[PDB]
Structure 1
Amino acid sequence: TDPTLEWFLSHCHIHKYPSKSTLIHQGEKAETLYYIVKGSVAVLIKDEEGKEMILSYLNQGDFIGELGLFEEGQERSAWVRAKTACEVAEISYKKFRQLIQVNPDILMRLSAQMARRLQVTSEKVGNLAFLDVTGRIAQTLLNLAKQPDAMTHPDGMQIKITRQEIGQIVGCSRETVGRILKMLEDQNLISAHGKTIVVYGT
């Protein structure tokens, strides 16, 4: 029971989007804010040759499309598509500004999230500039393992993720992920049960 959220949501018309539908479309004009009441989404940017990179996964309790909130003429800086089906609250930027004068804690929450995103996206920059593709993949496994949805295992931390996705995160061919995962195993660093990696603590 959160009085602030409930108060916030009561100003938003909620919507359900089926899995795989694009909630935000890059390049569109920014003039609306979003909040995930139910679901999970991927934020991602395309390459010149159509290759998609996943900047971030966002879940229930995350704001979406906030980056154009503090100025107009802004465009959505990325794509957001429903990973699973989502229940998503919506409110105009303007209407959201008013709420901020009543209770700016709803902005603290928003910004807190912006704060985290910036920290993580910065690590990516580091990884992308400091690590070969093997190390990038190692750090992406260690990263999904740090996470909440990462089940404990007698070896290390069990995660669940396709090779395609691992590719989209680190920035390479799924075929390449396959070969590199196999190598990481032969080095006693992980297991591979199809779409189930056990990241050893090593």
Structure 2
Amino acid sequence: TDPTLEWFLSHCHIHKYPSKSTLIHQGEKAETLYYIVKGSVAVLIKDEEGKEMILSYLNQGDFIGELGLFEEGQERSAWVRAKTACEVAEISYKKFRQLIQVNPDILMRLSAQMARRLQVTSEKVGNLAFLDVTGRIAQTLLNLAKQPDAMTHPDGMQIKITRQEIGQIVGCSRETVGRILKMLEDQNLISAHGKTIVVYG
């Protein structure tokens, strides 16, 4: 059982958010911490022209908006959009800091999540620096194929994903994803038809 989590949750005010709604806006003054009770969200950044890139998918049990907790006057570092319908707990940093005194184990949990996120984001940095847009998309297709939800196909592995989700992962437009996917098909690397993509061998 987890008494610490119930204790924490009891000090928050829980709300429901339909999918696609924005929970956090980049630039806002940060004064509250969030905790995903149910559902999943996408943490994303945009460029001066609206092109989006997902930094991470966050799910049940994950804290959100923790980056502004340690210093005053911080701004939210990214937008957070509900991927599915969510049930999110919210609490002011001020109240949260009071809880940390009563039981530091709650901070230990938050920090464990921050360390994992740093490891994963550093990994992305490596890829963005070493691969160009074509390689980024190819490697993404390979990783998707290696995932558990990836189905087995007569000629390799089959994955389901829209050209737009791929664009969000690599940080390019869906039209760009379209051109590269077309090129990859001509090189006999994949087979794209509808929302289904077959990765060969």
Give the TM-score band, short-chain normalised. 0.7 to 0.9
The 2-side partners of 1:2 and 1:96 are apart by 18
Q: By how many angstroms is 1:123 displaced? A: 1.8
Distance 1:18 1:93, change over 3 A: same
**SS of alignment partner, residue 68 of structure 1:** coil
The 2-side partners of 1:197 and 1:82 are apart by 26
Distance 1:193 1:72, change over 3 A: same
Other-structure match for 1:138: 138
Point out where structure 1 has 5 or more consecutive residues left out of the alignment: none
Point out where structure 2 has 5 or more consecutive residues left out of the alignment: none
More deviation, 52-61/77-86:
52-61
CA contact (8 A) 2:51 2:173 kept: no
**What whole-Å deviation, never above 9, does each CA across 1:13-65 have from its counterpart, x for those lacking one?**
11100111100011111110001111111111121112222111111221111
Q: By how many angstroms is 1:187 displaced? A: 4.5
**SS of alignment partner, residue 61 of structure 2:** coil
CA contact (8 A) 2:19 2:85 kept: yes
Other-structure match for 1:47: 47
Distance 1:2 1:197, change over 3 A: farther
The 1-side partners of 2:189 and 2:109 are apart by 37
More deviation, 38-47/156-165:
156-165
The 2-side partners of 1:106 and 1:59 are apart by 18
Distance 1:85 1:181, change over 3 A: same
Distance 1:148 1:9, change over 3 A: farther
Distance 1:101 1:196, change over 3 A: farther
Distance 1:190 1:12, change over 3 A: farther
The 2-side partners of 1:185 and 1:116 are apart by 35
The 2-side partners of 1:149 and 1:93 are apart by 37
Distance 1:88 1:148, change over 3 A: farther
**SS of alignment partner, residue 159 of structure 1:** strand
**What whole-Å deviation, never above 9, does each CA across 1:125-149 have from its counterpart, x for those lacking one?**
1111110111111222334445555
Structure ID, larger Rg: 2
TM-score (norm 1): 0.87
Pairwise CA RMSD: 2.2
TM-score (norm 2): 0.88
Q: By how many angstroms is 1:194 displaced? A: 2.2
Mapping of 1:1-202 within 5 angstroms? 1-147=1-147, 149-151=149-151, 158-187=158-187, 189-199=189-199
Distance 1:67 1:153, change over 3 A: farther
